[PDB]
Write a protein that binds this DNA or RNA. Structure first.
Length: 95
RNA sequence: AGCUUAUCACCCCGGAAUUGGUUUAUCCGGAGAUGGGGUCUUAUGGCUGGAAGAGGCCAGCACCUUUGCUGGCUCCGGUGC
């Protein structure tokens, strides 16, 4: 269950929301996992994948739109991409 | 004609729930709000050149007359379903 794993990292780990801040984290090497919404434009999705290739960052594709991804991270606004800086008690990186 | 002048739009920094901003009219923001600093269109307005030498309003003089001559002032504001 990705929703339960993603909910746990919010309460303990360090995360980052939004496209502009995610690219900054990948550029600095601080990112460990990126989650992309289903309805993200392909050109933006293609650019994010290219950035993760250069920094050797694992990419996960969320099975839902930006409305659904925002709910999973416990926010009342749409989220297009989520960058995980470091996990806490969750094992999302090892699953 | 020169300088300058803008709602909208756009850029940089930054990263938002204790949701904020905002129109008479409810729309916008992690696809990046509010905020701080910038860029641009010149509708339009301001100052200056054009240009006071013009035009306007008066006063004092010549005189059949071709008809003129000499003087001053022409400034500074307010208001709107």
């Amino acid at each position: 269950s990705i929703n339960q794993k993603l909910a746990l990292v919010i309460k303990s780990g360090k995360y980052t929301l939004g496209y502009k801040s995610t690219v900054k984290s990948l550029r600095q090497g601080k990112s460990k996992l990126i989650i992309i919404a289903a309805n993200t434009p392909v050109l933006r999705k293609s650019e994010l994948e290219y950035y993760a290739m250069l920094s050797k960052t694992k990419v996960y594709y969320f099975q839902g739109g930006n409305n659904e991804l925002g709910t999973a991270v416990g926010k009342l606004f749409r989220v297009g991409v989520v960058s995980i800086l470091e996990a806490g008690d969750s094992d999302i990186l090892t699953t």
